[PDB]
Chains A and B, each alone.
With several copies, the nearest count.
Chain A
Amino acid sequence: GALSNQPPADASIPQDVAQM
């Protein structure tokens, strides 16, 4: 696909987006 030179980050699944 769209090969990039830096590893992609992990997705964040917060119960409240304020506490992120």
Chain B
Amino acid sequence: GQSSQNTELPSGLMLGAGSKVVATQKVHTHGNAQTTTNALDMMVEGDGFFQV
């Protein structure tokens, strides 16, 4: 496994094994506001989560 030996020469040739999806990252940015006339639907402005 001497990769740094002659990495630019034919003896040091390295081949990749492909690609993969490491993660499906969530982007918790703040969404827009929907002003409703219902008296029981509510929004958290900023950091926080409702607990059920």
Asked whether the complex places CB atoms of A and B closer than 8 A, the reply is: yes
Q: Answer whether residue B1 sits at the interface, using C-beta atoms and an 8 A cutoff.
A: no
- Give me the interface of B with A, judged by CB distance under 8 Å: 6, 9-11
| Across-interface contacts of A16 in B (CB, < 8 A) | 9
Q: Which residue of A lies closest to B6 (CB)?
A: A15
- Give me the interface of A with B, judged by CB distance under 8 Å: 7, 9, 11, 15-16
| Across-interface contacts of B11 in A (CB, < 8 A) | 9, 11, 15
Q: Which residue of B lies closest to A15 (CB)?
A: B9
Minimum Cβ distance to chain A for residue B3 (Å): 14
Task: Please name 10 pairs of A and B residues whose Cβ atoms are closer than 8 Å in the assembled complex, sorted by A.
Answer: A7-B10, A9-B9, A9-B10, A9-B11, A11-B11, A15-B6, A15-B9, A15-B10, A15-B11, A16-B9
